[PDB]
């Protein structure tokens, strides 16, 4: 096997001709390209380039594909070096893959002339002037919907009707109803246009923010339908109307990062709740058995010290009651300490995941 | 192109003559300076110097300006190496730029003989003896001003006048007024001298501590003016007198670092308050709908569980009330946990910014 000597700035690197021909379309392998740098006087290919990098670009030839950056070569000087050597776009994506950088930007505009134009208007708000106008209008509509959900349940406005039941009306006299119907009109129109102008109708019931729009529309329609057509469903439907607060996540990049963080960390949250349940059983049992004898004590059950055990460990602190025996006080100081000890353990994993997803936007 | 071989301690580094002449005023490029080190016997320029550094000083010649320190060469040995090679002050500032070190010390004393001398007396307190005397007097005046703002609103001194209104006086009988006027006299004199002796009068309404002095002077003048010349302005003006506590930041280097930290971290504080508002709506709605049926419960509105939701999540804990149902207790333990989970997420960014600005004084 004949040998080839490449001299990158005085540093002689040597290899067998077979190794650099494994990849033939590359700069060193291609006979013609490499011929330019060759110097016939000393039989060596002189190049003037970074010394620490050309070591990694000979490993790629001798290892069938692996591309790993030395830890003392900065990213920019390496990216340029794969380019001069002509290792190919497959190679540079693998280098990006080894530095783990997200590479997905797939935006298939339909390109049917009108579907594409209105999709550009309604999806990407930075594109135009009316796109930012539509973003501002949608955020203000969501905000007044939240304000109607809370001011509706306030009692000061219902005092014309605060009367015993034994004595959503379409009478259009209640102002909360007509402003509520205007909000649901806007949500329905916006969702139907985002359905009919999308470039992928099969994938539309896959994105989670679309399923947030649907479950925000639903309960007003089923209460209108059953009203102009139950008592178990009504208390559930009145609390599925709180999900319009999560429909404010299409316009925020902080709520979307908290959704990624809470998805990618479910094992840690399960460990958090499991450790809490263990500690609550243990400490509530010990305070019940160390304070039951005293005639002036208040713990009357083991499933009655559970609230006291959760508030002392998390530190909110109120308690249903408070220990009055010397023994209850020793099991209450151990409970206070063990609480922060057992809830601070899985939290650094969660904040590290957030910090990663928070800087990956950059 | 003729080639030049430089031998730094046995390690042969080689380059084309063109590369080291790109920068001609430098030590290697200048023919005469480099001629001293040259040894004609072996046609190599022997130098005895650090091996890991001379690699980076050949990249600068071959990369048109980039200067990056290898990660295994300590700062001091590198700083000296750019000096021996004679790369120029533009080069050493760029090295300081790449280690990101603050380089701004612009103090334009006016140099008009008297304006410069009294500016040195009043601005830089370490310069003299009377400068530290003036610093000590200003700090003591600020402290007794805070003591008058709080002891004035105490009620024990007003019990000679605690009478119904239907029955800032310049009568000079109230001792709080005359000591208050002495404090505002000192603030006004000090600010007017710092105006008339400054070397840049156009930039004087740009520094934030100067605007703190002005908004600390203002409300005493407008209440004196309107008194010897409203009922909406009076309750606002009585609370803009609390900014004399921030006028104590010219004499502290910890308050100035907290101001830099809170300026450079506003996106994180916005995320903190936004996450809190989301959690407060969600958990107050769930506890209102899980405890309304019980006839002995106390939550009468969704905008009545808001305080309970803020104190449980932050852990102050008092609550307006406390859950009495099994369902209120499950939505109150989840609220306690999710509070610390959603407020501990943006805080490491803020403490990292503080730690950076806190050690950059060194």
């Amino acid at each position: 096997g004949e040998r080839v000597v490449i001299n990158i700035s005085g540093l002689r690197f040597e290899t067998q001709l077979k190794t650099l021909c494994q990849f033939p379309e590359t700069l060193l392998g291609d006979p013609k390209r490499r011929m330019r740098y060759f110097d016939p006087l000393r039989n060596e290919y002189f190049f003037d380039r970074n010394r620490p990098s050309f070591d990694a670009i000979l490993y790629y030839y001798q290892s069938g594909g692996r591309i790993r950056r030395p830890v003392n070569v900065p990213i920019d000087i390496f990216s340029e070096e794969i380019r001069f050597y002509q290792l190919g776009e497959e190679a540079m994506e693998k280098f990006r893959e080894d530095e783990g950088f997200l590479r997905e930007e797939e935006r298939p505009l339909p390109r049917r002339d009108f579907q594409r134009q209105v999709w550009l208007l309604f999806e990407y708000p930075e594109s135009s002037g009316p796109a930012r106008g539509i973003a501002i209008v949608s955020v203000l509509v969501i905000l007044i919907s939240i304000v109607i959900f809370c001011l509706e349940t306030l009692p000061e406005f219902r005092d014309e009707k605060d009367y015993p039941a034994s004595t959503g009306a379409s009478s259009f006299s209640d102002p909360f109803f007509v402003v509520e119907t205007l909000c649901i009109i806007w949500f329905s129109f916006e969702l139907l246009v985002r359905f009919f102008a999308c470039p992928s109708k099969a994938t539309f019931s896959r994105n989670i923010m679309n399923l947030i729009d649907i479950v925000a529309i639903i309960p007003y329609f089923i209460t209108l339908g059953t009203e102009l057509a139950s008592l178990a469903i009504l208390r559930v439907i009145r609390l599925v109307r709180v999900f319009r607060i999560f429909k404010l996540s299409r316009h925020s990049k902080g709520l979307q990062i908290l959704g990624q963080t809470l998805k990618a960390s479910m094992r840690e949250l399960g460990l958090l709740i499991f450790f809490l349940f263990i500690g609550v059983i243990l400490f509530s049992s010990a305070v019940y058995f160390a304070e039951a004898d005293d005639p002036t004590s208040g713990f009357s059950s083991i499933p009655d010290a559970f609230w006291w055990a959760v508030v002392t460990m998390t530190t909110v602190g109120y308690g249903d009651m408070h220990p009055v025996t010397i023994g209850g006080k020793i099991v209450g100081s151990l409970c206070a300490i063990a609480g922060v000890l057992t809830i601070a353990l899985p939290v650094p994993v969660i904040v590290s995941n957030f910090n990663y997803f928070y800087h990956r936007e950059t | 192109g003729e080639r030049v071989v430089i031998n730094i301690s046995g390690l042969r580094f080689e380059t084309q003559l063109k590369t080291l002449c790109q920068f001609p005023e430098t030590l290697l490029g200048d023919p005469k300076r480099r001629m001293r080190y040259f040894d004609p016997l072996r046609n190599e320029y022997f130098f005895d110097r650090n091996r890991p550094s001379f690699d980076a000083i050949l990249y600068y010649y071959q990369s048109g300006g980039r200067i990056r320190r290898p990660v295994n060469v300590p700062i001091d040995i590198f700083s000296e190496e750019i000096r021996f090679y004679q790369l120029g002050e533009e080069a050493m500032e760029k090295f300081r730029e790449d280690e990101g070190f603050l380089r701004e010390e612009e103090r334009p004393l006016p140099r008009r003989d008297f304006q410069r001398q009294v500016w040195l007396l009043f601005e830089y307190p370490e310069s003299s003896g009377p400068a530290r005397g003036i610093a000590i007097v200003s700090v003591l005046v600020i402290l007794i001003s805070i003591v008058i703002f709080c002891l004035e609103t105490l009620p024990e001194f007003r019990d000679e006048k605690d009478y119904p209104a239907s029955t800032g006086a310049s009568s000079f009988s109230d001792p709080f007024f005359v000591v208050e006027t002495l404090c505002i006299i000192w603030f006004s004199f000090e600010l007017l001298v710092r105006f008339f002796a400054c070397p840049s009068k156009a930039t004087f309404s740009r520094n934030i501590m100067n605007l703190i002095d002005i908004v600390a002077i203002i409300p005493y003048f407008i209440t004196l003016g309107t008194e010897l010349a409203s009922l909406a302005i009076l309750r606002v003006i009585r609370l803009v007198r609390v900014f004399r506590i921030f006028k104590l930041s010219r004499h502290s280097k910890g308050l100035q670092i907290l101001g830099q930290t809170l300026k450079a971290s506003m996106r994180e504080l916005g995320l903190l308050i936004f996450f809190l508002f989301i959690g407060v709506i969600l958990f107050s709605s769930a506890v209102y709908f899980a405890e309304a049926d019980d006839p002995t419960s106390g939550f009468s509105s969704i905008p009545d569980a808001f305080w309970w939701a803020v104190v449980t999540m932050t852990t102050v804990g008092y609550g307006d009330m406390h859950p009495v149902t099994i369902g209120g207790k499950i939505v109150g333990s989840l609220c306690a946990i999710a509070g610390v989970l959603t407020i501990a997420l943006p805080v490491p960014v803020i403490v990292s910014n503080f730690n950076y600005f806190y050690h950059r004084e060194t």
């Epitope: 009692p155 219902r158 005092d159 009707k161 605060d162 009367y163 015993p164 039941a165 034994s166 | 309304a292 049926d293 006839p295 002995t296 419960s297 106390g298 009468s300």
Partner: nanobody
Amino acid sequence: EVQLVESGGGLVQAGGSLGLSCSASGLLFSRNSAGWYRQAPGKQREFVARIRMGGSINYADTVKGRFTISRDNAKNTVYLQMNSLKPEDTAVYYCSSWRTGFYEYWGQGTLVTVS
């Protein structure tokens, strides 16, 4: 589980003065709206008084200025002070406390008939 018991009834003559009381357990009145309802013989119940939680008192036209409804806010007690009773009053009375949209509770009844 909850109960609304009341007393103070009987018969009275013209120009009388009396005070029915409503008490309960299983239901703090500090937290719920309450009122007194009467049912004249022959027609449906009408309202004597209402004290919506928060101290807002309203009365019907017949009892205006002759009746007061007060929650001692202590002892879970609501007391009505009727005054100068007239023969049109003859009726059977009832007590109540409710939360709009959730629950409604009644008393057993206690009558006051004016001679």
